[PDB]
Amino acid sequence: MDAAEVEFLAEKELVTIIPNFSLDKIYLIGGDLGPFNPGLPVEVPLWLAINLKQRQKCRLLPPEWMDVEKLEKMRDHERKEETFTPMPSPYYMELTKLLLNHASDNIPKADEIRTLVKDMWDTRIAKLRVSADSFVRQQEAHAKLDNLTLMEINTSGTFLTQALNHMYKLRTNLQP
Amino acid sequence: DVELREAQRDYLDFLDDEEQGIYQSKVRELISDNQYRLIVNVNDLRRKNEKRANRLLNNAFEELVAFQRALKDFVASIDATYAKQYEEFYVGLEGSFGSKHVSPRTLTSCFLSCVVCVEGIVTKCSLVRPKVVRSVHYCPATKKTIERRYSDLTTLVAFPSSSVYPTKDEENNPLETEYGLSVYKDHQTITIQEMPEKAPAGQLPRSVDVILDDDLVDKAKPGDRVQVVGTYRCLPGKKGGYTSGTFRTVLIACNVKQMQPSFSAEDIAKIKKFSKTRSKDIFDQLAKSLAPSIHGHDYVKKAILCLLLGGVERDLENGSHIRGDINILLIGDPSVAKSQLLRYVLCTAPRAIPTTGRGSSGVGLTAAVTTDQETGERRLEAGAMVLADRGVVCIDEFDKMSDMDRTAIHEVMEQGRVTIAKAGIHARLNARCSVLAAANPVYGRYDQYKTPMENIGLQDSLLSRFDLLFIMLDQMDPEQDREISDHVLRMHRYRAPGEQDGDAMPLGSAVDILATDDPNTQIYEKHDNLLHGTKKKKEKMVSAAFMKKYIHVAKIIKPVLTQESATYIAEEYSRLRSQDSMSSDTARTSPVTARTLETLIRLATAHAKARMSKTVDLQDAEEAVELVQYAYFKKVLEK
Amino acid sequence: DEGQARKSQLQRRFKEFLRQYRVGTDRTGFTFKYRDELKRHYNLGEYWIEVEMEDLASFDEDLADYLYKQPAEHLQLLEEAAKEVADEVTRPRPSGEEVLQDIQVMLKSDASPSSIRSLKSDMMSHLVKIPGIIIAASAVRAKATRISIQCRSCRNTLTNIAMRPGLEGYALPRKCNTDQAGRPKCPLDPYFIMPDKCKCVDFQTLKLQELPDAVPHGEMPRHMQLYCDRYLCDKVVPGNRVTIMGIYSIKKFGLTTSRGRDRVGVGIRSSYIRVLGIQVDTDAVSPQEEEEFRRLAALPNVYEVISKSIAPSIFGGTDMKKAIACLLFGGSRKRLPDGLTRRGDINLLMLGDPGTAKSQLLKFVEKCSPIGVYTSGKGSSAAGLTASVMRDPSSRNFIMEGGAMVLADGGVVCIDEFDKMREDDRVAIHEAMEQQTISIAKAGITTTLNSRCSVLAAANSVFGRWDETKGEDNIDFMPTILSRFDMIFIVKDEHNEERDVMLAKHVITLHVSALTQTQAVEGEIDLAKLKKFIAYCRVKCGPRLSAEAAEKLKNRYIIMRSGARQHERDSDRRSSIPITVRQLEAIVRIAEALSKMKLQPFATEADVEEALRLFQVSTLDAAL
DNA sequence: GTGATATCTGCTTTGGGTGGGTGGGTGGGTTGAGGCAATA
Ligand SMILES: Nc1ncnc2c1ncn2[C@@H]1O[C@H](COP(=O)(O)OP(=O)(O)OP(=O)(O)O)[C@@H](O)[C@H]1O
Ligand SMILES: Nc1ncnc2c1ncn2[C@@H]1O[C@H](COP(=O)(O)OP(=O)(O)OP(=O)(O)O)[C@@H](O)[C@H]1O
Ligand SMILES: [K+]
Ligand SMILES: [Mg+2]
Ligand SMILES: [Mg+2]
C-alpha cells in the first residue's frame, strides 16, 4: 500500500456540502445520495465533495471535530498520555490535508487547525518510533497498537515488518 | 556516595573470581613480580557486568577511583604487608572500547571525562621529574610528626592544594622535613601526533598532550608508534580572579602499548625446519622474495638482504672498534627502482629512518640543541642517524646533499659515533646504523663511454666508506623490456581481494583498529596469477610475515670465522688488490682497500647468519667474493 | 520582571515562527519547513538547524530587524525557542535519549555581502555578511559553556554558572558566601573551577583574507579573525572561499591591567567576528547533481564535450586541451601488497614559443581544478614549494609550515616560468613528483608529509624561440626531471596564412564579446559544473586496465623503446627526452583517466589507443 | 577633641607563553633555517 491508496480509502468518508444546483436523488452502487437543493446541506462522500468544489458547484462545511478548542484539547491529551489516544476520524490527516488544501476559503481558522493536526501527527509518529525501538530491543513476538490510523502505520510499516522478518529468522537459526 | 559504594562493591566482586580465577591469579602475579598496576581487560568486565563497564567508560574518574579502592582492598586481603608497602594501586585498561578508539584529530570535547584509546606517533618527550604525594614533618622540640597530602588538577580527584610545605607547628616550635619518609612519584609529559598517512588532504597532523605518572614513565620515546589508553580532562585555570573560559586538555594515561615479535613454539619449529631444509638455497630464496613488486635486480637484492642481516661488530680488549654494519650505495639511470627498493626497506625494517638529500641538514641528521620546555635548559634532541641507532637510514637523492652536510656523515658511516661540541654541550652519541643510499650520476644518465669514477663524481674516501656500490643501468633490450613490461602491467592490473571493481583509494582514513589486540604463520605466499604470473611456479616466494620472523631470529646469531674461510678470504683479497687492468675494458668503480677485506668478512658473516650457522664456511666466503667481484668492476665501452 | 516579560514575549514569537512557518501553495501542497528540519536533524543526532533571514522577515519583520540590530540577545532567545520546538516534535523519545540537547541555530541570508574594508566602528555589535578566503585555521580547542566553582576553605560550591559566548571570559566571586560566625574567614579569591563539572564545546579560530579583486591598488590584502564553535568548527580549511554571517565584536579580557599594561595607545580594543553561518563558494553531492553527473558520463561523446570545455576562449590547442582533461581527472593510485605505492597523478610540461597561451591555460586549470595552486618558478624556493622549518612566536619552538605542494595535495599545482627556476630549487621537487611525499630532517624535526599533487608546468626554450637547427640545445632540463613528466608538449608557433586569419578573427570577436551578456553554449559544460563533475569522478571511480588492453600496451611499448634506442644510435647523441618504465606507467595513467571520465571500472583497448595517440603527439614527437 | 601613628586589608607581583601577535621589539628571552645583497 502507498499513500495515494490510503487517501483513496479516506475519500469514502462522509462530509457535508451546500450545493448551488438542483438534482434528484442519485442511486449510486455505494448508496443513495439525497436530493440536492440550493442553499441546503447534504451529506456526500469526500471524493464527490472535492470534485464538486473544484467545479464551482458547492461550498464545504468543516466537520464537527475540526474545531480549534476541541483540537487543542485533543493535542494536549495526546501529549499527556503514553499510548495512542482515540482520534476524531480514522483518516484525520488525509481529511485535514484535502479539506484545507481545497476549501480553506470555507473553513475559518484553517491555519490553526493545520498546525494542531501537525502537532498531533508529530507526537503520534514519535510514539510509533518508540514502539518499534522497544519491539526490536526487547525481542517481542507481538504488539498491541490501538487507536493507530492506517496512514500512520503505512508511513513506516514496510520497514518495520521487513526488519522483524529478518530478526525472526536470526532468532530461529539453530532449529534443525 | 551510595553509587560510589555500589561501584566499589561491584569491582570487588569482579576481581574475586576463583568461584574461572583470572583476576585472582593476575593479582597474585602482581604481588609476585613486585608491581602495583593491574591491567584489566574491559571485555571481561563487560561480559560480567555491562552497566558497570559502560559507567567506567563514560564516567572515568569516579569509576577508576572506586576500582582502585577495591583493588587495594583485594590486595590487602591476599597479603596485607604488601598492601602497606605501596601508597596506591593503579588500574590499566585494554580491549575494545567501541567508539572510544580515536586519533588526535577525532579526540574532541565530547570525550571529556571518558576513557579513550588513542593511536599515534610520539614527537616530544620531557625529562622525568618527581612529584610530591605525601609529606612527613618532624618537630624536634615536641617530638611529634605530622603528615600532609597533596593533589592537583592532574590527580584523579582534582583539587588545587597548596605547594608550600609546613615550616612550624600551631605552637611556634619549628619543623623539619623527613625526605626519606615522604612519598614522591615520577612524572613526565609527552606529545602524540596523528599518523601522517591518515591525515586529510593538505592538512598537517594534529597532536595531543599526554601525562605519564609512576611506572608508565619512559615507556615511550620520540619516534615510537604507540597506543595510549587513558582519561580525557580539561585543566581550567584562572589569573587575577579571571578565567578566559578556554581550557587546555590533556590525556591522563592508564596504559601505554607499543605498536619485538612474539614467538610461539610452532613458529620456532617452522624456522628451524626452514633453516634445515636447504643448505645453499635459503639465501637465494630469501633475496628473491624481498621486494616482490620489483622485476629482478638480483645482486642488489642479495646485498640488501646482507645489509638487513648485518655483520658482527668487534670490540677489542684494548678498546678498539670494528663495525658490523653494512652500507650500500646505488647509483643509477632514471627509473630503475632505486627509490622503490629504499621505500621497501623503509616499510619492512624494524627501525628505518627516511631522509632526502635536499630536505636534510647536518643538524637534522645528527642532533639539535634547544631550550627545555621547563627551566629553559639547553637540551639535546636526537637527529635522524641517532634515531636510527641499531637501525637503518635510507638516504634518497644522495648526490643532492650539500658537501658540508655530506661530510657530517663520514664519522657515523665509519665509526658509528656522533660528537656534539656546541652551546656548552659536550656529548658522544651512539649512531650505529646502516646507510642505504641512492643517487644519480653527474650527467643524470650514465655515460658508458666515460669511466665509473668520472660518472659517479664522488671522493674516493666517501666511496671507500660504502661496503658495496651498485651501478644500475637502463639498457634498452627487447627481451628485458618484454619481461619488465609484463611484470609492471601485471602489477597495475592487480586488485586486492577485499576491494570491489571501480574502487578508488581515499585520501585519508578513519581509525580502523577497534581493539588493543588485533582480532585477526605460513612459510610460502599463496600463489596469485597476477602477482606471480602463469609460470609453472617452480620458484616459490617466502611470505612477508615469515620473512620478518626469520630475519629477526637470524640477526641474533653471531657466526665465528673459521680457518678455511679466512684463508680463502685472504687469498681472494690478494687477487682482487693485485690484479691491475684484470680486463683492459674493465675499470674499478671503487678503490680496493683493507676496508674491502673487512667488507668481505662482513658479507660472509651475514651469509652465514642467513643459514643460521654458527660458523662461517667456505660457501659463505664464496658468495661474498662473488658479490664483491660483481660490484667493484665495470666494463668501459670504446667508440 | 519587565525585562523578563519582554524576553519571554520575544521567545514566544520566535517559537511561533518555528512552529508555524510553511512553504508551498494551495495548488501543490504545504511543508512545515523548519519544524520538519529540526525533527529530522534531531533524530539523526545533528543538533543544529539553519534559518533564512528572509523567511523570518516574512513571518515577522520586527523579529528580523531585532536580530540584525542586536544579534546576541535575540539569537540566544531564538536558540531557546529552537530547543523548545525540538522537544515537542520528538517529545516521546526512546531509552538513552531522555536528556534534551541544545540546538545551534545557524543564519543564512540572500542579501548582498559587504567587504572587510567597509567594516567600520558604527557597525560594532551588529550582524554582518563578509566574503573572503580562509588563509589559516587553528587547532580545535575546548570552550566552557557552563562551570561549577568551589571554595578552597569551606568547600561551598556554586554550580551551573552560565558562560558568555565568544572570546569572553568570566570573573569569579571575590568573596565566599559561607557564614562569618564560627569558621576562620575564607581567603580572598577562594573559588576554583572544578574540572569534571565543566561543560565544553569545540571552538576554532580562523583568518579571513579579503578577496583579491577587492584589494585597493598598491595595498597588501587585509585579514580578519573569526571565532567558530560547535558545528561551525572544522568546516572550512585554508584555501576555501567563503561568505560568513557573524557578529562584529570586541575581545573582553580581564578588566585589570595585569603585567602593568602599557599599550602604545589608550582605550584601543581587539576586534573579531563571531561566526553564525558559513557558505562555501564554488570559486556533499545532492541526488539531483549525482543523477546529472551520471548522465554526463554516459554521453557517447563525453570526451569531446569535456575537451571543448577546457579554456574555451583559447582558439586551438585541441591535443593539449585533451591532455589537460586527462590530468584533471587523473589515474588510479595503487598500493601493492608489499607496501610499495604506484602514483596515479599525471604530470604535464608545455615547452614552447612565446605568446601561445601557455600561461592562460595554467590560469584556467587553477580555476577549474577542485584543488588548484598557481605559482611562479621565478618567485619560488625549495622550502616554499615543499615545506619550511621556522620558529613559532608563541611557543618559542620549531614548527613546520607547508609549501605549495602541501597546499595542493589532492589537486594540481601550476608552475609557470618553470625554466626560470633555480637548479637547487627545481631539484627539491623530485621526491614529491614521484613518491608523492616530502621528507624533512631539520632542527630536530623528522617527519614525512603527503604531496599527492599533479604538476602542470610551462616554460620557454633556451633561445627564446625554438630553433630547429640547434636541435638538442633547445632543452636545458636534466633527464631526471624530464622522465617525471607523463607528457611533454613542444609548442611551436607555426606561421600559416589560413590559420593566422582564423585566429585573428577569433581574438577580435573575443574582445568585442566582452560587452555581450553571458550566454550558455550548447556543446560545453560551465566551469562550476565541470569543477564539481571532476571532484565527483575522482572519489567514485578508480579504473584498472583490462587484460586485453594490457597486451596491446605491452607490444607498443617494446616498439617505442626500440625506435628510441635506434634513433639515439643513428644521431650519436643521447636524446634529451628519455623513454623509461615511467613512460609506460604514464600511458596506463592516461588510459585510466579516460575511463574515469566515463565512470567505467575497466579501461578498454580504445582507451589505450587514445592514450597512445596522446603520447605520440606529445612526447615521442619531442623525442624524435 | 586633633594629630600622629600603629594596625589592618586588598592589590599584584613572577617574566610566559591558555595573555595577544589586531600591543610593540628603544620594555626583555642561542639555535637553527631561510631569504637578501654583495660576494667570489
Ligand atoms: N624493474 C622494475 N620493476 C618494477 N617496477 C619498476 C622497475 N623499474 C621501474 N619501475 C617503476 O617505475 C617507476 C620508477 O620510479 P623510481 O622512483 O623507482 O625510479 P628511480 O630509479 O629511483 O629514479 P630517479 O633516479 O629518477 O629518482 C616506479 O613506478 C617503479 O615502480
Ligand atoms: N591561440 C590563442 N587564442 C586566444 N588567445 C590567445 C592565443 N594565443 C595567445 N593568446 C592571447 O595572447 C596573449 C598570450 O600571452 P600568454 O601569457 O598567454 O602567452 P605564453 O604562451 O604563456 O607566453 P610566454 O612564453 O611569453 O610567457 C594572452 O592575451 C592570450 O590570451
Ligand atoms: K609582554
Ligand atoms: Mg628516485
Ligand atoms: Mg607565459
Ligand SMILES: [Zn+2]
Ligand atoms: Zn567560604
